[PDB]
Structures are given as C-alpha cells and as structure tokens.
Design a binder for this molecule. Structure first.
Ligand SMILES: Cc1ncc(COP(=O)(O)O)c(CN)c1O
Ligand SMILES: Cc1ncc(COP(=O)(O)O)c(CN)c1O
Ligand SMILES: Cc1ncc(COP(=O)(O)O)c(CN)c1O
Ligand SMILES: Cc1ncc(COP(=O)(O)O)c(CN)c1O
Ligand SMILES: Cc1ncc(COP(=O)(O)O)c(CN)c1O
Ligand SMILES: Cc1ncc(COP(=O)(O)O)c(CN)c1O
Ligand SMILES: [Cl-]
Ligand SMILES: [Cl-]
Ligand SMILES: [Cl-]
Ligand SMILES: [Cl-]
Ligand SMILES: [Cl-]
Ligand SMILES: [Cl-]
Ligand SMILES: [Cl-]
Ligand SMILES: [Cl-]
Ligand SMILES: [Cl-]
Ligand SMILES: [Cl-]
Ligand SMILES: [Cl-]
Ligand SMILES: [Cl-]
Ligand SMILES: [Cl-]
Ligand SMILES: [Cl-]
Ligand SMILES: [Cl-]
Ligand SMILES: [Cl-]
Ligand SMILES: [Cl-]
Ligand SMILES: [Cl-]
Ligand SMILES: [Cl-]
Ligand SMILES: [Cl-]
Ligand SMILES: [Cl-]
Ligand SMILES: [Cl-]
Ligand SMILES: [Cl-]
Ligand SMILES: [Cl-]
Ligand SMILES: [Cl-]
Ligand SMILES: [Cl-]
Ligand SMILES: [Cl-]
Ligand SMILES: [Cl-]
Ligand SMILES: [Cl-]
Ligand SMILES: [Cl-]
Lengths: 307, 307, 307, 307, 307, 307
C-alpha cells in the first residue's frame, strides 16, 4: 500500500505517524515548490543510484529562495535525508522521490516571509520505461505557457502546474497523448512535465532556457551525452512551431518522463520514426548511465548500498 | 481553538474526524477552486445573514466546471451545507466561510476529468472592520497579473494566488500595505485579493471584467448600491495607471476585505482622504445591508436563525 | 452542372465563354477581395429576394479601395449586375452569389495601383438550413486571428482565408465541426467564416468590431432584430474565452452560415441547448425576413421577379 | 508571347492546352504554395544551370506538407519535371521557373486534407542584373510582418504576399524602391520578396530564421560564400531597426532579386556605397557560381545540356 | 522681436532680465512639463479671451504631480500669472501662451523629489487659421506611440515629443503634412501635437483616452459642441487604422492646431472633403466660442480687458 | 564655482560668455543627444587620460545622425575640442566631460532636418570611486524600458532619461539605491544610467544589445578585459529576471558609474558579496587601464599633457 517511512521537518517517521488535518495545507500549497528525483536499482551491485541528487537539491533550495521561504533546510540535509529515506524504506527497485517544501501560516491565499518553512520527502516505487520502445502523439496547446512576467517557469512551483493542466486536459480531450506549449511570443517552450528536443539534419535543437522553461536536469544531461558520447551539434536557441513539424525525430525529457519519443506533432509525423536512430542511441546511453553501467558519468550518481 | 464541525463530501463531521495523511492533497491542490463567503451576526434578531450565498455557490460551480471537475455537488447542496454548518457550529458572531473543491487522483501535478470531485466547507470566526475608519497605502506591482492566455482570472483557482503572492510579498518588502496589478497590456486589473474602485469628479470608475479580474460579488454589490442608493455614475472600463494616481478616493472591495479605503497609490495621496466622502457613504450602506438593517436588499441575504 | 451565365468585366456571358489560361490569375489572387450574397426564393411570390445587396456591394467597394484597386466598377453597377445575373440564370431557388474583384499585372506576388481592376460575379444554387434544427461543436484554435498590424480583417481578402484554414483544418483533425479564433491579445474574435454571438442571462453578447473581425452584415441584421423584434439587450464588447464556456446559448452568423447554433465550445455544453430558446426565435425571425414574409424589414430585400 | 510548354499534374503539355474556367482556382489559391527557381544560361557550355533545384523542390514539399496537401508529387519528380520543361521549351537564355502547388475542392475559402493536390511548373525568360551596378532606396514599412502566431513565414504560401503588398504599395506611394519589414516585437525581419543583409565593421549581419522570415536559399548561399570564399564573420541574430541605419552596406537577396544592393534605409545612406566593396565581391562570386564558372560550388548546379 | 515681459518663479520680469547660462537647464528639461494656452483677441470688446485657462492650469498641476515635482505653484497662481502677463505685454492680438515647469538640481539626467520646482510662462503672438479653409494630408507613422508602460501620454512632458519627432520627421521626408500614431496594440492613438476625430455616417468617432493619448481640452470642447449644439452622436472608443481610411471627414484638434481638417490618410481621400460639412460647422462654432461671440459657452473664457 | 572655459559651436569661450535667454533651448532639448566621457588624472605622469574618446565621439555622431541633425561637426573636431577644453581648464584631477548636441528652430516641440545643428562640451571635476569598496541595493522597476518601437535606446537622447527617472524615482521612494529595467517582453535590459553584468558559476552574463539597451563603451571594455586578462567566458544573451536573483555577483557599468557592485536585487543577496571576487579583479584591472598604468590597453587612452 504505502512506503514504510517518509521524511518530514528534519526526521524520518513511520508513514502512519504523518497524520494531519484536512484543513492544514491548502493555503500552504500556493507557496509550495518541489523536485522529482529518480533512484535506479542495480540488482547486480545491490545499489540504488540516485541521479543528480545534489543538482536537484540545489534547484529546490533555489526555488525556495525565489518563493521567499525563510532558510530552514540546507542542500546537504536534503541530499542526506533522500539517501536515509531510500535506505530505510528497504525497497530494492526503481523509485521516484518527491521533496516538497512549503511555507505555513497566514490557514489564510493572497506574506511568505512571515511564514515558517517546512518540507517532506516521499519516495515510492516507480517503473522505468527505458527498456521499452514506445512513442507519444503530441499537440501544441491553445493555452500559452506561463512566463517571467506573471509566474516564472524557472521556479518549480506547484501552482505552475495549473497551467500544465489546461494543456494536458486539452490534449486528452482532443485525442493526443501529450501537449507542448508555445510562450506568449509564440515560440516553442516546453511540455506540461518535461523539456522537448528536436532532431533535424543530424543535429539536436532545444528551446533555450529564456524561452520560458524549467532548467531541466534531464535536458542538461542529454546535451552533455549528445556532445560528449555521440559528437553531435546541439543548438539551444529560439525554436519556431512550424520547424518542429519537419523534425526527423523529437522527444520529451524529464526525470519522471525519462526519454520519451514523440511520433508526431499536430499530426505531422517525425520522418525517422519514434524512437528514431539518434533518440534510440541517447535513450540507451542515458539508461546505462543512470543504472551505474557507465563509469564516464559516475560523478552524476549517488549510490545507496542496500546490502 | 477550532470550530466544532466542518462539512466534507456531503456530510457534516466533527472537526477532529477530518484527519488525513500529510501526502494526500498536494497534487489535488493544483486543481482546487474556492469561495470566500461572509456571515454577519445580528444580535438583535438572533440571526446570521450569509451574504449572496447563491451567487457564491454558482461561481464555485462555474469555477469547478472550468477546471473540468466531474459533476458531484449542486448549487442547492453547497447553499444548504453552508447554512447547516453555520448553525451546527453554534458560533453567534461574524464568520468567514471557505468552500474548497478539488479533484483527487493522478498522488500524481502536470488529467482532471479522470479524477473524482471532492469538497469541504470550513467556517471560522472573522471580525468585520466596517465600524472602523482605517486606510491602506498601495503600490502597483512590478509583477504582471495572470490573463486569459495562461491562467484565466475568472476561475477562482488556488494556483492563481501564487501570482497574488509575488505582488503581496513585493508590497510588504517595499513598505506598502497592499499591491495592485497591471495586466499584460499595462492596464489596471485588480488587487491581490480584492477588486479596486476609484472616485474622480464625483463618479465611480472600476476596471471592466475583461481587464483580467475576478468577477467580484462585492464589486457587483457596490455598483448596484452606488447607482441605486447614491444615484452615482459608475464606469466599468479600461483604466490607466496614471489616472488612478489622480483619484479623489480609492478603495478595495472583496468578501474578506469588505470595503477597504486606499490612502495612496505609489505615494500619490487620494485628494479627498481615506475613507473619502463617497467611500464613507458606500461603506455605511454596505454595512447596513449585510447586517440585515436595509429591507431594500433583503433578497441578497440568507438568514440562519440560531434562536 | 454549371449555371447558364456569369458576369465578368461589365457584361453577362455564357458560362462556357469564360475560358482562361491556367497561369492567368495566381498572382491576381493575392490582391483579390470578394463578397458572399444570398438570394432566397419565394415560390408563392415568384420572386428572388437578394438580402442586403447594396450593403454587400458597398463593402466590396470598400475592400477594393483598401487593396488599392483602381476605380473601375461602381456600387450601382455591382447591384445591377447581381440582379441581371440571377434573372438570366433562370434558377428559381435559393442561391449563393460571389462577386470577386482582382487586380491583374505585375503574371508576377510581392504594386497594386499600377494594375487593372477586374471583377466577376458567380451565382450558384445553394440550400438554406433555416427550416432545420442542427448544431455544431466548436473549439478555440491554437492559431491566432489576423489583426490590423499584419492583415486587416475588415478587408474581405481571399488571402485572409489562409489563416481561416489553419483553424478549420485543426478543428477537423481534432474532432470538432468548426473553429473560433482568439485575437493576439487573447480575446474572442470570430469564426473561420462567420461572426459569433453568445447568450447569457437573457442578453446577447458579441465581440466588438475592433476585436479584429469582419464587419458582418448578418451580425448587424441580428443586432437589429434582437433589439427591435425581441426587445433584448445586446452588448458589442471585448469578450473573454472562459466566459463563452458558460454561455446559455451560442451561434455563428454569416451569409453562407445563416444562423448556425453552437452546441458546445471546447467540450463545454451550452446550458440551454442548440438551438436554444433565443437562438430559435432569432433564426425563425431571420428566416421570415429573408424570404420576404416580414414587411417591417422590406428595405433589406432586393426583389427579382422571375415571372 | 508565351513559352512552348508547361508542366501540369505529371505531364508536359503545349501551352495552349492548359485552358481552364475563370471560376476554377480562386478558392484553390488560398491553399497555394510556390517556389522561385532560376536557370542561368552558359552559352560557352551550351548548358542551362538550374540553381539549387533539389533544395527548392524540398522546400516546396515542406510547404505543401505544412498546408496539409495530400501527398501526390515527390522531390525527384519536381526536379525531373523542371529539367524536362527547361529543355522542351528550347529557350537558350536565363529563365525564372515557378512551380506552384494547390489543393482543389471545397469551388468553395474558409478543409485542405479532403481536397486533391495539383501542381504546375511555368518557366519563362527572365534577365539577370548581376553584370549591372544598381541600387535601391528602402523604407521600413508601417505594416508588420506575418508571424508564426497567424501565418507562418516559413511556409511559401501565396496568401503571405497580401502582407508583402501592404508594404510594397506603401513604399511605392512614399517614394521608395522597396520595403523592409519589422516583426511584431519590432525587430528586423525580411523584405517583401527577399531576405536582407547588413555589413558593418567588415562583418555580415542578417536576421535569424526565427525573426519570422522565409528560410531563403539565396541567404544560405551568401552565408556559405561569405565564410568560405571571403573569410568573413557572419552573424545570424536578432537585428534592430536603428543599427541597420548605420550599416556600411546593405543588400537584398533572393532567387528573383539575386543580390540587390541597398543605397539607403529610411533616407539613411549606407556609408560605403551600393554596391559597397563586400557586396560587390559577393555579387561577383555569386555570379561566377550560378553561371557554372566556379568548380568549388558545382554541387549546387543542375546542368541541362541543350546541345 | 520679443515680448516685453515673461513670468518666472512668482514674478513678472522684463524679457531681457531672464538671462541664464548655456549649461543651466539641459538636465532640468528631462523633468519638464508644459501647457499650450491660446488667447483670442476680440477688437470689438477690447478683450482677450484666454480659453479654458483653469482646465489648462489644473492639467499642468497634474503633470507636475505625476513628474513628482515638489509643490511650489498653485492652480490659482498659474491662472493669475497668465492673465497678468497677457495684460502687461500689451499685445492686442491672438497669442499662444506656454507655461513650462521644471525641477532643477541633480546640473546632473538619469531623483526628481530632491530637486526644487520652478516655472516660467511665455506669451507670444500667434495667428489663428479659423477663418481659413485649408487641409492636411496625413500618414500613419512606422513609429509607435508611447504608452503607460514606458512614458505615460497623459503627462504633458517635453520628453514625450522625442517620440512625436520620430513621426513628424518621417511624415515630412515621405511627402505628408502631418503624422498619426498607432499604439503598441496597433490601434489609433493621436497626432504628434493634437487629437484626431473621424466622421462617418453622420457620427463623430475619436480614440478613447485609454488608447494612449493626451486628455486634450480641445477634444473635450469638440465633444461638448458636437453633442450640445449640433445634436451629433459621438463615440469615444477603440478605433482601427483601416476604418479611418473610410472616414467621410477627419480633423486634428488641439490648442495650437485649433481644428485642422485632414484631406487624406495614407493617400485615402476623405469622401466629403476637408473641411467637410460637419467639420466646417464645428470649426465655425468653435471660432464663435473662443472669440467671445457665443454666450452659451462664456464659462470657458477668461476675459482680460486691455481697455 | 565653475570651470574656466567651455566649448560651444566650434570655439572655446570663457564660462561667463555663454549667457543665453531662459526661453532659448526648451524645444531644442527634445532633439538633444549627449555623451559622458571621463578624464583620469595621473599625477606621476602629469597627464590626463581621456578614456575611449574617439569611440564616444563616433557614438555622438551616430546619435546625431539618428536624430536627423544636419551635419555640422566631425568626429575629429569633437575629439580635438575635448582635448583643447581639458587642457585650457587647467584642472589637474579627474573630470567628467559632457558633449551635448541639439538642433534649434521650430522656439517651437512636436521637423529636425529644417533646424541648425549646435553643440557644446562641458568638462567639470568628478571624483572616481575605483579605490573604494562600496555596493548598491537594486530593484527591478514597475516601469518598462523604452524600446525600438517607440524611443530607440541605442540613441543617447536626453528624452530617454524621462523613462530612467520613472525608475530611479521609484527606487528611491521604495528604499533602494538604484533601479534595473525589464524590456516590454519582460527580459532584463539595463540600469537607469549604466549596463548590468551578472556573475554565476564563474562566467559573466550581460543582456545582448538587442535587449533594448545603450551600446555601453564601459560594457565593451569589461567584455574585452574579462576575456583577455582574466580568461573568463562572457555570454551576451537574453537574460531573465529570476536568474539574476541567483547571481553570485552583479555590477553596473558605465562611464560615470565606473564599475559599481550590486549587493542585492529585489532583496536577493548576491552569494559572493559586493564587490565579489571577479568584480574586484575587474574593477582593479579597469582602474589600472584608465589611469595609464596598463600598457596592454594604451590604444584606449588619449593623453593630454598638462606639463
Ligand atoms: C514543466 C517541466 N519542465 C521540465 C521538466 C523536466 O525537468 P527535470 O529534467 O529536471 O526533471 C519537468 C519535470 N520536473 C517539468 O515539470
Ligand atoms: C483576486 C481577487 N479578486 C477579487 C476578489 C473579490 O471577490 P468577491 O467580492 O467576490 O469576494 C477576491 C476575493 N475573492 C480575489 O481573491
Ligand atoms: C471571416 C468571416 N467573418 C464573418 C463573416 C460573416 O459576414 P457576413 O454576415 O457579412 O456574411 C464571414 C462570411 N462573409 C467571414 O468569412
Ligand atoms: C518573402 C520572401 N523572403 C525571402 C525570399 C528569398 O528566398 P530565396 O532566396 O529562397 O528565393 C523570397 C523570395 N522567394 C521571398 O518571397
Ligand atoms: C500629443 C498631443 N496630443 C494632443 C494635444 C491636444 O491637446 P489640447 O487640446 O489640450 O491642446 C496636444 C497639444 N497640447 C499634444 O501635444
Ligand atoms: C541608459 C544608459 N545605459 C548605459 C550607460 C553606460 O554607457 P557607457 O559605458 O558608454 O557610459 C549609460 C551611461 N552613458 C546610460 O545612460
Ligand atoms: Cl515502498
Ligand atoms: Cl555541454
Ligand atoms: Cl554543439
Ligand atoms: Cl519529474
Ligand atoms: Cl501523424
Ligand atoms: Cl467556531
Ligand atoms: Cl447596476
Ligand atoms: Cl451609471
Ligand atoms: Cl474573500
Ligand atoms: Cl503619499
Ligand atoms: Cl443554375
Ligand atoms: Cl441596432
Ligand atoms: Cl441593447
Ligand atoms: Cl458568406
Ligand atoms: Cl460537450
Ligand atoms: Cl520561352
Ligand atoms: Cl556556413
Ligand atoms: Cl562566422
Ligand atoms: Cl524568388
Ligand atoms: Cl539618403
Ligand atoms: Cl508681444
Ligand atoms: Cl459631453
Ligand atoms: Cl453621443
Ligand atoms: Cl498646443
Ligand atoms: Cl489622396
Ligand atoms: Cl574646473
Ligand atoms: Cl571581446
Ligand atoms: Cl567568451
Ligand atoms: Cl555616463
Ligand atoms: Cl538582501
């Protein structure tokens, strides 16, 4: 049913001890920021590898700074709590870990810095699809992405996802698997829960960070692997809607989404299939990295030996 | 400490029975919509008057429709639950009532229509300031209001308030009481938790609804009272920033905020004071209406006799 | 197969005489403007009624002025040619008439005033659906309406319809009957080939002309009939996307489209059905006007007696 | 008068056989896309060189995909038809070739994918000005360029040219030779029928493709020649209006326009003349390439031996 | 050569006494705001009539408040100084009066409230053209009007006129008499030194104040006279570019410009001439008002008897 | 009190001879453009070093060209006049020099090319803070930066500073030292009188020139020194608001401002202090360059030997 433990406000506690009142956190949720972190289980080594844990912890501390949450937790404490929780839950398999920080008050929605900062970390089993060949059909949404003027997409805020839900609900009702956003200027931004890459003429293209997107750690990883392992040109730039319709390949990338091939965009089929040849290479390389089977990228992994 | 009861998913329950898990509602909160409703206690009559309850219930049903929450609760059930909760709590004094609806799943942030719709209603004591002469100093925020392109302000969504908090935190750190927003086109919108009115040359001016604001019930009330009781001209129109600096009077209006006079905007003082003469008249008329002391507007009140 | 005649460059000619070269008009088409005009056949009177012919002729002369076509044809000549063509074709039934004006040169796409102005008028049988109860399911498009900055929608230019086709192709591939547009500011504009009306709380709402729409003659007609015959309030104003989801009724209006009820918008159902009660009244009144069965509006009709 | 032949729907036919009805293609023209291709005659070799034919054919297939025209013609068939038509016309001199594809139906303007795809190719004599020293006086237009939100400029659609004509008519009435566009954000885009380059401090500057321009093949050619033959720095970037007023040199480039020097922009004279020194070098190099007198760039030429 | 006197910092002084250093006011000019006021000489009465002096004085006090100039001068003092200067100059003829207020410091361009407020008033002969039938040819500028986001056009600031000069220089170099502006949204704003009115179908149309214009006193005057004397409908609303091309009449209005008919806009001729029939009526009525020959509007005039 | 001399219209004159009338230059100021130039006194060498004089003179000639001032002064004459004035004033200490050019007429605000071009140069003592460790607290303004659509920020126009003053007055009233601007798209632009740099992860970031900023000579200098002396990566790119809150260091740069460290931005503290380590290095290197103590950059200095 539930994991054995969670982490909450500087301590590991049994799951059933984290009882609260229905009314306690609705106002707090408007302040909340979070991370998505994966642990990949290597049965041959008896080790969980938590992927880019310090980078995720640093981004959570940045998000919390941008919300104006008083300082309460450090990067090293978030890292250590994650390791301690994954070991104590004693689940030997792939996991998805969600640290979530919030400021509690004003049970009252419309100032953050007068509130107290709290955090929990919740680790649950989650399967990987990196051994599976699958693809999604995407649409561009009629709803525009949040931007720096109103709700900065650099901040990984729960509230941002209300805009994600406009797009993801439209995609589902209109017969698509997933939605991509345009920014207010009409340029390509990101997906509802991932960044997007395009392959054309043997090069990788992705919206630059100032297109109004999350600074995706899976995006950064893919840029490094594409340049370093495959020797590909990668362009971080402004990207137009119609050029993406002509892509040879496309894929989403994100911690939960891993590397998710895109078969079509607004019913324009990616010419080289899904996963196409370069996407297949990147998904296979990414898989060997996160499972601790590529020594070149060991510095990205935090091992948790579970004996 | 706490009210005796709350209402949750079609039943009144004792407060202490509404226990839940820490992890239960974070994803749900991204779907959530809510109302703010006041009950005003008339000790002479032994009656609570809930103000424009059906209008609030109808707006909540509209918000829930716009989020795409499956149909579960009706307008008549929301009204009746509110009456039943205010009576059962047996608190003979002014209250603030928050119905909050949410869709629960995907404990997973980035489709609503596959989720189940839930709701609670929480009524707590809240004082009125309508017998008090006070005023606030406002600033226009450096942060822009959400708009129809990204997060429609007609929908009373919890997530909208992340944008309110950008502005309200800036106002507090910059030495102001409260913030006003501009919309993306640079026109005046609303406050962080209220609509705004301006008085100039004996007429009332307020941003039109398509300026990108909540369709405030207190705004509608004030328009009716200004025209019907005081015989004033009221203009619902596009409003510019600099014209508001020259206002004779200004005020916020909202269910929680009631009628809150504004003394200055970006350190431009309202010429006729705060509350100025017309604001004083409207605050006094509004007070006599909501306490059940003006028979002309009885159709706005839901009485709860508490014997 | 084909009508007996058409009108071309100041004369009626037999259909088969209007032969031209494949290469003759591609460049000309970028300059072209047109009208849609209906003739309604009244078998009891032996008369075709051409609806608001002078208004259509005047708009065509305005469009041609805005394209900068040299003066060649007058309003009275367009009216007379239409009457002469409908009589000479000797088709006793409902028709749709398309005058189309173009400037020919530079067989060369990227100045109009150095070109010669030409025009034809093509009248063909077209059925009316005004005795039929039917409705369409609409979506708002991901593609934005043309605006005054780039391609003024007041000008009834053929080229405008490339933007209509972006939206109408998306609607069809996404399982809708018809598309509605937002303008660049995110406000409701028009349909791909019609204006749109909304009914809420017993009043009619339609985007104002400066929302970036054609100055629809069917729109003007409906405003007059709603105010004069039904006594309804009609608001020409800025209209938001989400308010239209809450409409009691909605309908398209246009010369070809007549009055076309809308059952839903982005899968939000119009509460009072389609045709709803007010839409039904307007469609029935409009039908009695255009068939010459309402003497109050005779001044809108041009009769062509066909003996 | 006319060329001997044209190509239409998979066959070469005598010119006089391509007769059609006046009414046949007006609706089709709203779907239409096209290319401009030059053939350069080398009398010493008895060979026509068609410049970058496969690149033009590929762009036409992309445009047709973006319009959603059913698949009917291939890249290899467009190339072969062009070669076959230039040879069969037996005109030994410079030509301009226009393939034009259209979808025919709905003789009815406001879905493409239900239509049948057709195409013709029209080759006519056209002189080169590459041995001539001439320059144009440009203005920036008061009319804004089409953008991805409304009418993507990557698609070489006939309808786009209605926006070109707003600008080119203004330039002519205001005493200029040619117009340049700003995009909606106010940045430099393209000319009405060409891309634009600027020379300042010995480097070449041109608007990046996401400024909202056609992906000009003459632009690509000029970038290659500037870097490879002249060793110049070339910057593809966002370009401001006022910086272009300070350019040392400027020029248009396009298939029909070739390399067309600009003497002034809004009556600011280019400091180094027109053609200035670098423009002269590029025009001379481009001329030697397209006439088959530079073996380094042979892979750009398709020779048609005409004996 | 020069007037006898000017007014400066609370006193009338002989002209030749207002000597200053070249370097004294360049930084001050960035803070400066001003008014334009006319005096009309009635030789039959021996009286100068200063038109709407208190309204001009009030707008200057508003401009100075918006710049944040410390309070130094009152409305009554500005009025009295104007009267005193026009009498002391002893010029019996039409005048144009410029009060100009500035804040002096930081001889240092990039805080106002730490500066001292100063003002002068300069009255000079200026002829009226209200007995003359003349018209101007206008263009819409390629340069956009200042808006509330960057430089509010309600404030009558000297610096605003740098944007006026972009447009007025373009008009002159492009062979027009005068320029009209579009605002950033592409809607009609104002002229470079006047507001604009359009006449179509017997009604008057003018951009609403929130289109981003000065709140012109001549505009207000014309609205009153059109409604009260002529019984015309006047619409203050958003106005589109292309509708103005179809106007029957058009005119500029402003204190210096008086009522200046517009013959054409971007070489579209106003159908009913310039001055057209309604413009002629308004110019004649305005003339009889400002010369003290219409008792209905005496309350607009400040008489200065000069014996 | 005052310097001995100034330069005006091709000649050096004693200060007291530059007397003018109060009314002479208000209209002229709307046309005016200027430069800020520093002279740094090296007592050991007996030499003033004027920093990048030719670059400043060239930018002034560009500004004057963009205003459309008739040609009157050359770059070499501006350079020589500056040298001649600094020597003749015989002030042996640090100076700030302001050339200011204006066009005089139409004493009449709303065409430049019909006016006569004039210029003065004013040199005054000004201290350097380059031996001082100090920092400023910045805010982002609620007022937007001027852009190419309305008032190009490349032109160093006096009128631009009205927009600077909106921001600098807000910063002062809101308890900050200095203001930073966003451009209309919401991206980081410049300060009110300087460009801005950010340091993060050991690299330098600054808004690209097309973000809507002055082409700062101190910015160019800092880019050269950072790359050439320190070997740092420098990124000229679009910059977001929230990324700047996370900067390790930040600083303003400009001729008057020199290198001015920023301690915080909207009350987000720069992690590595102010001046932080890289800022300290750049300020020290810049100081040794401008005082003639670094032979590598001698070509930037104009020496004036004062014996
Ligand atoms: C909106 C959005 N964008 C991008 C991503 C991908 O980010 P990361 O690779 O760091 O998981 C996510 C998932 N966190 C997301 O929710
Ligand atoms: C953003 C916002 N705007 C306006 C209002 C005022 O709305 P009402 O008068 O219906 O309470 C509120 C309070 N609900 C609000 O939060
Ligand atoms: C885009 C558009 N808008 C509106 C309309 C309706 O115009 P009318 O009622 O004049 O036919 C049409 C049909 N002409 C249209 O094509
Ligand atoms: C709008 C536009 N832009 C650019 C170009 C230049 O494109 P190319 O060099 O591929 O001819 C053209 C001519 N096809 C054009 O019409
Ligand atoms: C920009 C602008 N707009 C409008 C006007 C007209 O204003 P008024 O009628 O008050 O003179 C003027 C002249 N003051 C002006 O300069
Ligand atoms: C607005 C603005 N921006 C930037 C700068 C810095 O420019 P520079 O380094 O050339 O002095 C200045 C000072 N001239 C300025 O006023
Ligand atoms: Cl578990
Ligand atoms: Cl990398
Ligand atoms: Cl790379
Ligand atoms: Cl994730
Ligand atoms: Cl597909
Ligand atoms: Cl209680
Ligand atoms: Cl009312
Ligand atoms: Cl009213
Ligand atoms: Cl509330
Ligand atoms: Cl104040
Ligand atoms: Cl027929
Ligand atoms: Cl009507
Ligand atoms: Cl009405
Ligand atoms: Cl039609
Ligand atoms: Cl539905
Ligand atoms: Cl031929
Ligand atoms: Cl290259
Ligand atoms: Cl290069
Ligand atoms: Cl071409
Ligand atoms: Cl020139
Ligand atoms: Cl005088
Ligand atoms: Cl009035
Ligand atoms: Cl009226
Ligand atoms: Cl004036
Ligand atoms: Cl004309
Ligand atoms: Cl000195
Ligand atoms: Cl460099
Ligand atoms: Cl670098
Ligand atoms: Cl400076
Ligand atoms: Cl701080």
């Amino acid at each position: 049913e539930n994991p054995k433990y969670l982490w909450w406000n500087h301590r590991i506690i049994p799951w059933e001890e984290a009882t609260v009142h229905l009314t306690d956190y609705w106002w707090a949720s408007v302040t909340a920021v979070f991370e998505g972190i994966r642990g990949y289980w290597n049965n041959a080594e008896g080790e969980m590898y938590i992927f880019r844990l310090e980078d995720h912890a640093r981004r959570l501390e940045q998000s919390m700074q941008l919300i104006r949450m008083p300082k309460e937790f450090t990067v090293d404490e978030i890292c250590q709590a994650t390791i301690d929780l994954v070991r104590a839950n004693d689940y030997r398999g792939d996991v998805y870990i969600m640290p979530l920080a919030y400021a509690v008050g004003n049970k009252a929605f419309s100032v953050v810095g007068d509130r107290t900062t709290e955090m929990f970390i919740y680790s649950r089993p989650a399967v990987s699809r990196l051994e599976e060949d699958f693809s999604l059909h995407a649409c561009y949404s009629s709803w525009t992405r949040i931007n720096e003027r109103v709700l900065p997409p650099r901040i990984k805020a729960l509230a941002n996802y209300r805009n994600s839900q406009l797009a993801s609900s439209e995609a589902a009702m209109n017969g698509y698997d997933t939605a991509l956003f345009l920014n207010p200027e009409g340029k390509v931004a990101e997906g509802t829960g991932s960044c997007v890459f395009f392959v054309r003429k043997g090069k990788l293209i992705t919206p630059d960070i100032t297109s109004g997107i999350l600074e995706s750690i899976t995006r950064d990883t893919v840029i490094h692997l594409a340049r370093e392992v495959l020797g590909l040109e990668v362009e971080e730039r402004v990207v137009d809607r119609t050029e993406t319709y002509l892509a040879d390949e496309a894929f989403l990338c994100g911690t939960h989404a891993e590397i998710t091939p895109i078969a079509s965009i607004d019913r324009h089929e990616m010419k080289h299939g899904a996963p196409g040849p370069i996407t297949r290479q990147l998904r296979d390389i990414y898989r060997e990295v996160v499972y601790g089977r590529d020594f070149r990228y060991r510095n990205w992994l935090t091992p948790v030996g579970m004996g």
